[PDB]
Amino acid sequence: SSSSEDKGKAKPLFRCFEREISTGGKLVKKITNDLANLLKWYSVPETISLSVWISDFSKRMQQLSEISESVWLGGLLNPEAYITATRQSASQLNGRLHASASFNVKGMALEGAVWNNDQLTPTDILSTPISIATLTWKDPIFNNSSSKLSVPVYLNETRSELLFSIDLPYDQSTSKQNWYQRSVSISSWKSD
Amino acid sequence: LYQFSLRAFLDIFYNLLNNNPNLVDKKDPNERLVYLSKDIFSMTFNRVTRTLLNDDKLTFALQLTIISVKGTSNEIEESEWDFLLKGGDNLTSIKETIPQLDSLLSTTQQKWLICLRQQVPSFSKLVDHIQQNSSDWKQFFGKDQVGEPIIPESWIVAQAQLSNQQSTIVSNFRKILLMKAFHSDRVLQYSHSFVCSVFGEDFLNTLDMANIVEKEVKSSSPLLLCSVPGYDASSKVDDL
Amino acid sequence: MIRLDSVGIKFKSDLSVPSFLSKPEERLNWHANSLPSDELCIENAIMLKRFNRYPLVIDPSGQAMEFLMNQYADKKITKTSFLDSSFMKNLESALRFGCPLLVQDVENIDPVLNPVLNKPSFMIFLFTRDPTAHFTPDLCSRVTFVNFTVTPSSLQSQCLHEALKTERPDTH
Amino acid sequence: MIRLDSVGIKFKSDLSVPSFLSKPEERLNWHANSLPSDELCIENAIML
Amino acid sequence: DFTRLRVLNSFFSLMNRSIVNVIEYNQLHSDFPMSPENQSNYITNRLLYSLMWGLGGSMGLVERENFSKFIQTIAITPVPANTIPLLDYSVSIDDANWSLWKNKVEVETHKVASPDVVIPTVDTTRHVDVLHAWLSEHRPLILCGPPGSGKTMTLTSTLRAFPDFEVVSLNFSSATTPELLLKTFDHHCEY
Amino acid sequence: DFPSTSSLTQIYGTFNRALMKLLPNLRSFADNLTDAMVEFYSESQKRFTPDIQAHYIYSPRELSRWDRALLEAIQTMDGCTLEGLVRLWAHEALRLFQDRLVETEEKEWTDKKIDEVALKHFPSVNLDALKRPILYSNWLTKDYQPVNRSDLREYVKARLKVFYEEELDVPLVLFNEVLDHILRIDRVFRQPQGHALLIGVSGGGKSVLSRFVAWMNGLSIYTIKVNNNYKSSDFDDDLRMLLKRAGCKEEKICFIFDESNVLESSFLERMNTLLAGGEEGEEFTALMHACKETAQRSEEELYKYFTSQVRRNLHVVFTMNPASPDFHNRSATSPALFNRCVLDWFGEWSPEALFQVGSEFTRNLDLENPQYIAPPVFIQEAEIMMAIPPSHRDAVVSSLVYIHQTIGEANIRLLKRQGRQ
Ligand SMILES: Nc1ncnc2c1ncn2[C@@H]1O[C@H](COP(=O)(O)OP(=O)(O)O)[C@@H](O)[C@H]1O
Ligand SMILES: Nc1ncnc2c1ncn2[C@@H]1O[C@H](COP(=O)(O)OP(=O)(O)O)[C@@H](O)[C@H]1O
């Protein structure tokens, strides 16, 4: 009754977005009409309320639009792809990922840590958002890697789909063991 | 996993009347009805708790509680028992804000407060209270502050007077609502506490398997031991 | 009656409003004054007595105006009309001396009576000769209609009673 | 009952189908035989 | 009713106005007058523009829309795509080529729904251009539509954008007569 | 013609974006408001077309009165929450769209769209915002603000006890609709050039209620006393004075003019002119001499001053029965009436109102009977509406209502058979 009536009012890179836009649309239309009738073409957390799926869904299609006229990584429909893409594009120019001919992402979050003084350091928060980051594919630097911490970037909280892995320096004041058990990770998608 | 039978309740009811320890000396009618009125709850919980997984012993305890005060002085308002179950369920659609409180509350926090003032009449004057006496709600809405959140006594009294409800039990319930709204990790702490202010520090406490299987279970009723993966009850049986 | 019955309220099944609001003696005097004997007139006579709002009589055949004229002579009954201006004054006199005033040709009633009809021994009777006449909803609301136009049943009675009254004068 | 009343058929405004079809003694024994003591069951009892 | 002279006058008055914008334009930009190129495209556009408002003004809305389409699907001179009723377009005195009305022309809390405020739209805009041509010629135009449609507003507003007009309202009734209208003069004018 | 929905959304979107500055806490609800006002307005305009009822014409004028009423309310309140903004939006929708409706079936459609639109655009609003009845009044608190049937009744009931000794000693049953009208009429009197058009049954309450509220606003009541010999020359006379006390005396007045009052077509025209703006021979002298006189207490400017008092000091309350053949054609006759006044449809008295009146008029009669058993057909009747197990008194009063209605229908039948009305 009330539930459906509601939802209704809310309804080597170009290669990539082409499929996003494309795919999004098909889903736009698909769900657009499928509802009208009555009267997960992408990955998201097991449990997650309907209102949020919709709320988030709606925000993703907009993400989509802003892309047409022309990057919320964990908001795209195929994050894996966008990356495997940038691999070649970022490669089609200059050419192992690395953070800081390279792209920039926003919408990610630090889980179990915070970034103070160009490094990972302890916190009382379960997770804090990252406004943006620069990644670059290398071949060069990954040599001083025994003094840095490997932080995995998962599609989302569940920690069940790894997009890629990124190396970062950490507040050496704490043990490398204290860190390994802290289990810091990065979610590319965080709800609010 | 929670299939309970009428026969099972009737069995509890029988003992509430006859085999009630708490009631084996007095014979006065208007005296005995006192124990009878309250013991139905605790006695039912004693028998049901044996089937419930730990995270559900309080959940069912809250239901039993809400029912026991029904029709008494300290009976929980519907709007109040409602907010607990649905409160803020729509948060992701709240566009109203509370400017007057940016120096004190986050965005989501404000949103939540709008729900409270909006859904529950007892909290009609919460935003104005938070406004007038900021330094009490101070540490409450505050980040990394050692010390458990503290709902200001000033509020636990101001509101205890606005509504014609000066009851502890009801007061303890209004505390769950604030916690659901601003500290979800405290919901259990405070629920437990509320339940305990109706029955007793003890009602929610952990069972001789001797008696049960002996003089407390009719032979027509089997004994199941539904367990969690990897856990084997098999032993327990062979023992007895 | 069906409503009163389906709800549990008690009333008389052989009830007759007239014989419940008038004595068989007065009803008799009514007939002596040219009240046609037909339950329709007898019923109308009752409204002409216990009327709350004033009465506006629909009497095309004139059978009523005769009645009321006799029935009320006693109290100096006046017969005026909204025609000649001689009217207005009669109204003033009849509201001062409390006498019954019958006014013909309601067809054009000055609105300068609404406060009268809307409100001591005074009373007014509005009349019509038009059986096929139309009055506004306003008038309808401030009036107590009493319809004297005869139906085939009404006449059958008037005659039968008249017949007997002559044929079997003894039993009458 | 509304129907009967509307048609002019006379009946007991407050008729207990259970009393109309079983003696008070017949019931005491029903309960003594474990019939739950509620209006629904007493009604069921007459059906049985 | 449709009468031949009623629409031709409405139309002549516009065409004329058109040409007056040239006289007027130069009169300012005397510096470097209008190019033959322009005084033709512009005028020839102002002709087609003038036909739809001079004859379509007295038509329904969708009517005038169909009617304008027609003009477009027959005209010679350059006309915007058959994907926007020439109605939605105007004619710029500079470029001299068609323009989109949408490209044409805030409030204070307390004057919000205040009677005298007029949030400008495509309608009010193209309306002042048309009424301007008729008011300049001092013709007796008639704004016709249902009550609330914007008539009283459209007028008092166009006249506001011309400080040389002193307007005086009057509300005719079933019994208005030469005299009433007359008396209303002897109280603003001088014989 | 009428601006389009897009054209409109843009016009009022601007108005609202600017009005919502008085409410920083609701800044994101502005375009929200515009979409709801523009949507409900369009829906009503298409559901209520002239072929159904003459006066069922609508225009952006509604959207404007709507926005101006919003602006006024908001200016007299220390803040407002979404629910506040939504209830205010519903209330004004009801005054500007529902009051005029004739059939209940038409008012329900309205009550339904209001709710429907409100949820489509104000999804986070709590339904408590739309709890019926949606009432408002400036009589029980400092400024405008919601009110409920009870508190309002205890009030009007008190203000009525004093109205009786003084003014009119006619007992008024405050049934639901009555409360609804002595509030709508109020709004009208609380405004400049405020004129009302009450159309309904005769003896339904239009005049007495118009009085009680003329009285509440300290307005003086006036009415021409027409008679079987009252000429179209008799009128301007009273007119000279009515306006006289309004402009010169600065005396607030409620002129309750009835449809029977127009004994001549010329009669409408006079009012039809004074209906809008505010307003010869030797007369024209004192009609300025007094001006001057009070003007005290340039010639032309002097007469504007008079015609400017009348306007914001005199109130016209027209009353009509939509059954007298001097009705429908009345609009085509005096187009300022159903076009300049606030039309409030009284209509008939509901079965619920009839229950009340019959109830209170028999409050002192002994209609008790402890030996009375409510029959099944009647216990059911109370169910749809009266004590848990209907009482003897209930049986009586409700049967007074039932009987009243049988006469309505017997009338329809009489008409469809003997053609008598
Ligand atoms: N573009 C607009 N800007 C502001 N208000 C408008 C606009 N269009 C319509 N309106 C509103 O619609 C109403 C139209 O009334 P008006 O034009 O004065 O009467 P009529 O159309 O009967 O002559 C006005 O009250 C005004 O508030
Ligand atoms: N709400 C009410 N309760 C009780 N009596 C009423 C009510 N409304 C009207 N009446 C009675 O009915 C009469 C109605 O007259 P009035 O309202 O002045 O005329 P109209 O309704 O035709 O304009 C009054 O004299 C009054 O006594």
What's the gap in Å between the CA of B124 and the closest CA on chain A? 26
Q: Is E153 in the pocket of ligand 1 (CB under 6 A)?
A: yes
Q: How many CA atoms lie within 13 A of F79 on its CB side?
A: 10
Burial class (CB in 10 A: 0-12, 13-18, 19+), F377: middle
Peptide-bond breaks in chain C following residues (C–N over 2.5 A): 119
Q: Is F354 in the pocket of ligand 2 (CB under 6 A)?
A: no
* Interface with chain A: mutation pick from F35, F113, F115, F119, highest number of A CBs within 10 Å: F119
Which residue do the tokens 């007139």 mark?
C41
| Set of chain F residues whose Cβ sits within 8 Å of the Cβ of D1 | 376
Residue owning the nearest CA to atom 4 of ligand 1: E118
Q: Residue F74, Cβ neighbours under 10 Å: how many?
A: 20
- Between the two ends of chain D, the Cα-to-Cα distance in Å is 24
A159, A185 in Cβ contact below 8 A?
A: yes
Quote the CA–CA distance of B49 and B61 in Å, as a whole number.
Answer: 9
Rg (CA), chain A: 19
Q: Is F357 in the pocket of ligand 2 (CB under 6 A)?
A: yes
Quote the CA–CA distance of F335 and E174 in Å, as a whole number.
Answer: 9
A6 touches F at CB < 8 Å: yes
CA E152 to ligand 1: nearest atom: 23
Nearest C-alpha neighbor of E18 from the set E54, E50, E63: E50
Q: Is the Cβ pair B96, F26 closer than 8 Å?
A: yes
Contacts of F345 (CB under 8 A, 6+ apart): F99, F100, F101, F102, F199, F200
Q: Residue B136, Cβ neighbours under 10 Å: how many?
A: 16
Q: Is the Cβ pair F202, C137 closer than 8 Å?
A: yes
Record the tokens describing residue C121, joined without a space.
Answer: 């021994």
Local structure of residue F372 (DSSP, 8 states)? -
Q: Nearest-5° angle of CA C157, CA C161, CA C163? A: 115
Quote the CA–CA distance of A135 and F366 in Å, as a whole number.
Answer: 92
Q: How far is CA F104 from CA B44, F46, F100, F107, in A?
A: 53, 18, 11, 5
Quote the CA–CA distance of F42 and E103 in Å, as a whole number.
Answer: 27
Residues linked to residue A186 through DSSP beta bridges, in sequence order: A110, A153
Q: Sign of torsion, CA B214 B219 B221 B223?
A: positive
**Residues B25 and B135 grouped into a single domain:** no
For F346, the enclosing helix (H) or strand (E) is strand F342-347
Which residue do the tokens 């040409």 mark?
E19
Buried b (16+ CB within 10 A) or exposed e, E103-126: eeeebeeeebbeeebebebbbbbb
The bridge status of strand C55-58 relative to strand C144-147 is parallel
**Residues B136 and B198 grouped into a single domain:** yes
**Residues B153 and B192 grouped into a single domain:** yes
Nearest C-alpha neighbor of F262 from the set F305, F224, F209, F205: F224
Q: How far is CA F155 from the centre of its chain?
A: 19
Q: Is the Cβ pair D13, F380 closer than 8 Å?
A: no
Backbone dihedral region for residue B71 (phi beyond 0: left; psi -120 to 50: alpha; all else: beta): left
E-strand stretches of F195-252? 196-200, 220-222
Contacts of C38 (CB under 8 A, 6+ apart): C150, C153, C154, C155, C157, C158, C161
Nearest-Cα residue of chain F relative to residue A7: F120
Q: Is F170 in the pocket of ligand 2 (CB under 6 A)?
A: yes
Local structure of residue F344 (DSSP, 8 states)? E
Contacts of F201 (CB under 8 A, 6+ apart): C137, F321, F323, F346, F347, F348, F349
Record the tokens describing residue B140, joined without a space.
Answer: 């409450």
Q: Residue F331, Cβ neighbours under 10 Å: how many?
A: 14
Q: Treating both helix axes as pointing N-terminal to C-terminal, what angle do C24-32 and C63-73 enclose, rounded to 10 degrees?
A: 110
What's the gap in Å between the CA of F82 and the closest CA on chain A? 18
Residues linked to residue F253 through DSSP beta bridges, in sequence order: F220, F314
F343, F100 in Cβ contact below 8 A?
A: yes
Domain that holds residue A136: 79-192
Contacts of E58 (CB under 8 A, 6+ apart): E2, E6, E7, E10, E144
Which residue do the tokens 């004028």 mark?
F61
Ligand 2 site-directed mutation target among F168, F208, F258, F357, most atoms within 8 Å of CB: F208
Contacts of C124 (CB under 8 A, 6+ apart): C54, C91, C94, C100, C101, C102, C103, C113, C116, C117
CATH number of the CATH domain containing A144: 3.10.490.20
Looking at residue D19, its amino acid is S
Q: Residue B140, Cβ neighbours under 10 Å: how many?
A: 17
Quote the CA–CA distance of F421 and F406 in Å, as a whole number.
Answer: 15
Quote the CA–CA distance of C49 and C100 in Å, as a whole number.
Answer: 12
**Residues B65 and B171 grouped into a single domain:** no
C45, C73 in Cβ contact below 8 A?
A: no
A58 touches B at CB < 8 Å: no
* Residue F67 dihedral angles phi and psi, to the nearest 5°: -70, -35
| Set of chain F residues whose Cβ sits within 8 Å of the Cβ of C89 | none
Residue owning the nearest CA to atom 10 of ligand 2: F205
DSSP H helices, D2-47, are 2-7, 17-20, 24-32, 39-47
Looking at residue B161, its amino acid is Q
Quote the CA–CA distance of E129 and E89 in Å, as a whole number.
Answer: 12
Annotation: binding site of E for ATP? 145-152
E54, E63 in Cβ contact below 8 A?
A: no
Please give the order of strands across the beta sheet that includes C78-81: C78-81, C100-104, C123-128, C55-58, C144-147
Residue ranges of B 91-120 with Cβ closer than 8 A to chain A: 92-93, 108
Burial class (CB in 10 A: 0-12, 13-18, 19+), E81: exposed
Diameter of chain A measured on Cα atoms: 63
E59, E145 in Cβ contact below 8 A?
A: no
Quote the CA–CA distance of E16 and E46 in Å, as a whole number.
Answer: 10
Q: Is F13 in the pocket of ligand 1 (CB under 6 A)?
A: no
SS3 of A138-179: the string is CCCCCCCHHHEEEEEEECCCCCCCEEEEEEEEECCCCCHHHH
**Residues B95 and B192 grouped into a single domain:** yes
Domain that holds residue B100: 73-205
Residues linked to residue F318 through DSSP beta bridges, in sequence order: F197, F257
Q: Sign of torsion, CA A80 A86 A88 A89?
A: positive
Record the tokens describing residue A72, joined without a space.
Answer: 């919320």
Residues linked to residue C78 through DSSP beta bridges, in sequence order: C101
Q: Sign of torsion, CA A121 A126 A127 A128?
A: negative
Looking at residue B40, its amino acid is I
F383, F345 in Cβ contact below 8 A?
A: no
For A5, the enclosing helix (H) or strand (E) is helix A2-10
For residue F133, cis peptide bond before it (omega within 30 degrees of 0): yes
| Set of chain A residues whose Cβ sits within 8 Å of the Cβ of F122 | none
F117, F36 in Cβ contact below 8 A?
A: yes
Resolution in A: 2.8
* Residue A167 dihedral angles phi and psi, to the nearest 5°: -95, 135
Which residue do the tokens 């009436």 mark?
F337
Quote the CA–CA distance of F159 and F166 in Å, as a whole number.
Answer: 11
Nearest C-alpha neighbor of C1 from the set D45, C85, C13: C13
Ligand 1 geometric centre to CA of F317 (Å): 26
Nearest C-alpha neighbor of B83 from the set B122, B109, B56: B122
**Residues B96 and B181 grouped into a single domain:** yes
Ligand 2 geometric centre to CA of F320 (Å): 14
Quote the CA–CA distance of E5 and D7 in Å, as a whole number.
Answer: 79
E-strand stretches of F201-331? 220-222, 253-258, 314-320
Q: Treating both helix axes as pointing N-terminal to C-terminal, what angle do F351-360 and F392-418 enclose, rounded to 10 degrees?
A: 130
Residue owning the nearest CA to atom 15 of ligand 2: F203
**Residues B15 and B97 grouped into a single domain:** no
E177 touches F at CB < 8 Å: no
Q: How far is CA E37 from CA E40, E81, E97, E100, in A?
A: 6, 22, 11, 21
Contacts of B4 (CB under 8 A, 6+ apart): B48, B51
CA F321 to ligand 2: nearest atom: 22
Q: What CA dihedral angle connects C42, C43, C45 and C46, to 10 degrees?
A: 130
F421, C133 in Cβ contact below 8 A?
A: no
F68, F54 in Cβ contact below 8 A?
A: no
B120, B177 in Cβ contact below 8 A?
A: yes
**Residues B20 and B58 grouped into a single domain:** yes
What's the gap in Å between the CA of A45 and the closest CA on chain F? 25
**Residues B15 and B38 grouped into a single domain:** yes
Residues linked to residue F315 through DSSP beta bridges, in sequence order: F254
Quote the CA–CA distance of C77 and C55 in Å, as a whole number.
Answer: 15
Residue owning the nearest CA to atom 19 of ligand 1: E148
Annotation: binding site of F for ATP? 200-207
Which residue do the tokens 């556009």 mark?
E45
Q: Sign of torsion, CA F47 F52 F57 F63?
A: negative
Q: Is the Cβ pair A55, B89 closer than 8 Å?
A: no
Q: What CA dihedral angle connects F403, F404, F405 and F406, to 10 degrees?
A: 50
Backbone dihedral region for residue B43 (phi beyond 0: left; psi -120 to 50: alpha; all else: beta): alpha
- Facing F260 at nearest CB: one of C7, C111, C134: C111
DSSP H helices, B87-154, are 107-119, 126-132, 134-137
Quote the CA–CA distance of F403 and C4 in Å, as a whole number.
Answer: 10
Resolved by = X-ray
**Residues B172 and B150 grouped into a single domain:** yes
A75, A57 in Cβ contact below 8 A?
A: no
Contacts of F256 (CB under 8 A, 6+ apart): F207, F210, F211, F214, F221, F222, F223, F317, F319
F135, F147 in Cβ contact below 8 A?
A: yes
- Facing B93 at nearest CB: one of F26, F81, F124: F124
Q: How far is CA C74 from CA C33, C44, C96, C161, F169, in A?
A: 12, 20, 17, 27, 35
Quote the CA–CA distance of F376 and D14 in Å, as a whole number.
Answer: 10
Residues linked to residue A170 through DSSP beta bridges, in sequence order: A120
Ligand 2 geometric centre to CA of F384 (Å): 28
Contacts of B174 (CB under 8 A, 6+ apart): B80, B122, B123, B156, B159
**Residues B77 and B178 grouped into a single domain:** yes
DSSP string, C44-69: HHHHHHH-SSPEEEE-TTSHHHHHHH
| Set of chain E residues whose Cβ sits within 8 Å of the Cβ of F335 | 173
What's the gap in Å between the CA of A124 and the closest CA on chain B? 7
Nearest-Cα residue of chain F relative to residue E108: F18
SS3 of E89-129: the string is EEECCCCCCEEEHHHCCCCCHHHCCCCCCCCCCHHHHHHHH
Which residue do the tokens 């003890």 mark?
B202
Which residue do the tokens 């334009």 mark?
E25
Q: Residue A89, Cβ neighbours under 10 Å: how many?
A: 18
Record the tokens describing residue F159, joined without a space.
Answer: 């203000």
- Facing F228 at nearest CB: one of C3, C9, C82: C82
Record the tokens describing residue C39, joined without a space.
Answer: 């339950």
**Residues B194 and B97 grouped into a single domain:** yes
C153 touches F at CB < 8 Å: no
* Interface with chain F: mutation pick from D1, D3, D14, highest number of F CBs within 10 Å: D1
Nearest C-alpha neighbor of E92 from the set E83, E84, E104: E104
Record the tokens describing residue F3, joined without a space.
Answer: 């601006």
Quote the CA–CA distance of F338 and F316 in Å, as a whole number.
Answer: 12
Nearest C-alpha neighbor of F274 from the set F381, F208, F195: F195
Nearest C-alpha neighbor of C22 from the set C1, C43, C52: C43
Looking at residue F322, its amino acid is P
Q: Residue F309, Cβ neighbours under 10 Å: how many?
A: 21
E15, E137 in Cβ contact below 8 A?
A: no
DSSP string, A31-94: HHHHHHHH---S---SS--HHHHHHHHHHHHHHHHHHHH---GGGSS-HHHHHHHHHHHHHHHT
Q: Sign of torsion, CA C13 C18 C21 C24?
A: negative
Q: How far is CA B139 from CA A1, A124, B147, B178, E121, in A?
A: 43, 16, 9, 14, 53
DSSP string, A113-138: -EE-SSSEE--SSSEEE---EEE---
Q: Is the Cβ pair A51, B143 closer than 8 Å?
A: no
Ligand 1 geometric centre to CA of E8 (Å): 29
Q: What are the CB-based long-range contacts (under 8 Å, 24+) for A82-88?
A: A82/A16, A82/A20, A83/A163, A83/A164, A85/A12, A85/A13, A85/A15, A85/A16, A86/A13, A86/A137, A87/A137, A88/A12
What's the gap in Å between the CA of E109 and the closest CA on chain F? 5
Which residue do the tokens 């009490």 mark?
B136
Quote the CA–CA distance of A44 and A25 in Å, as a whole number.
Answer: 18
| Set of chain A residues whose Cβ sits within 8 Å of the Cβ of F119 | 2, 5-6
- Facing E107 at nearest CB: one of F14, F269, F273: F14
Touching chains C and B? (3+ Cβ pairs < 8 A): no
Record the tokens describing residue C107, joined without a space.
Answer: 């067809």
Quote the CA–CA distance of F152 and F164 in Å, as a whole number.
Answer: 18
